[PDB]
Amino acid sequence: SHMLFQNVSIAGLAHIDAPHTLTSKEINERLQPTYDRLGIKTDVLGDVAGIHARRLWDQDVQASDAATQAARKALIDANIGIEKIGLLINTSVSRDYLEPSTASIVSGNLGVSDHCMTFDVANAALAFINGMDIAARMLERGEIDYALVVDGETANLVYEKTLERMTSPDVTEEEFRNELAALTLGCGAAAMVMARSELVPDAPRYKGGVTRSATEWNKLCRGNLDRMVTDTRLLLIEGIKLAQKTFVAAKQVLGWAVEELDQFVIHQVSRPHTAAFVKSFGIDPAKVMTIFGEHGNIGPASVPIVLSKLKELGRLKKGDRIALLGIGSGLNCSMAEVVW
Ligand X SMILES: CCCCCCCCCCCCCC(=O)SCCNC(=O)CCNC(=O)[C@H](O)C(C)(C)COP(=O)(O)OP(=O)(O)OC[C@H]1O[C@@H](n2cnc3c(N)ncnc32)[C@H](O)[C@@H]1OP(=O)(O)O
What is the binding site for ligand X (CB under 6 A)? 42, 44, 48-49, 125, 177, 180-181, 184, 221, 230, 232, 235-236, 239-240, 243, 266-267, 269-270, 272-274, 277, 297, 325, 327-329, 333
Binding site partner of 272, from its own copies, ligand X, none, Cβ cut-off 5-8 A by kind? ligand X
Among 123, 268, 270, 302, binds its own copies (CB under 8 A): 123
Q: Is 104 in the site for its own copies (CB under 8 A)?
A: yes
In whole angstroms, what is the distance from residue 307 CA to residue 272 CA? Answer: 21
Answer whether the bond into residue 19 is a cis peptide, omega within 30°: no
Of 23-31, 48-56, 100-108, 172-180, the window that binds its own copies (rule: CB under 8 A) is 100-108
In whole angstroms, what is the distance from residue 338 CA to residue 197 CA? Answer: 13
- Of 19, 28, 29, the closest CA to residue 48 belongs to 28
- Give how many residues touch its own copies by CB under 8 A: 60
* CA distances, 27 to each of 36, 43, 95, 162 (Å): 14, 11, 25, 11
24 vs 211, beta carbon nearer its own copies: 211
CB environment 75-88: b (16+ within 10 A), e (fewer): bebbebebebbbbb
Shortest Å, Cβ 285 to its own copies: 28
Type of residue at 152? G
Binding site partner of 177, from its own copies, ligand X, none, Cβ cut-off 5-8 A by kind? ligand X
Binding site partner of 186, from ligand X, its own copies, none, Cβ cut-off 5-8 A by kind? none
Type of residue at 161? K
In whole angstroms, what is the distance from residue 254 CA to residue 271 CA? Answer: 27
150 vs 180, beta carbon nearer ligand X: 180
**Distance, C-alpha 235 to centroid of its chain:** 17
Binding site partner of 42, from ligand X, its own copies, none, Cβ cut-off 5-8 A by kind? ligand X
Binding site partner of 187, from its own copies, ligand X, none, Cβ cut-off 5-8 A by kind? none
Please give the DSSP secondary-structure letter assigned to residue 93: S
Shortest Å, Cβ 314 to its own copies: 34
Q: What are phi and psi of 227, to 5 degrees?
A: -155, 135
Q: Is 299 in the site for its own copies (CB under 8 A)?
A: yes
Angle among Cα 294, 297, 298 to the nearest 5 degrees reads: 105
Binding site partner of 192, from ligand X, its own copies, none, Cβ cut-off 5-8 A by kind? none
Binding site partner of 3, from ligand X, its own copies, none, Cβ cut-off 5-8 A by kind? its own copies
Which residues, in sequence order, are CB contacts of 203 under 8 Å at separation 6+? 9, 10, 11, 195, 197
Q: Is 107 in the site for its own copies (CB under 8 A)?
A: yes
- Of 332, 339, 340, 335, the closest CA to residue 121 belongs to 332
The 136-175 site mask, x for binding its own copies (CB under 8 A), equals -xx--xxx--------------------------------
Shortest Å, Cβ 339 to its own copies: 21
C-beta of residue 123 within 8 angstroms of C-beta of residue 78: no
At 4 the three-state DSSP class reads: coil
Name the site residues for its own copies (rule: CB under 8 A): 3, 93-95, 97-101, 103-105, 107-108, 111-127, 130, 134, 137-138, 141-143, 211-218, 221-225, 228, 242, 245, 299, 328-332
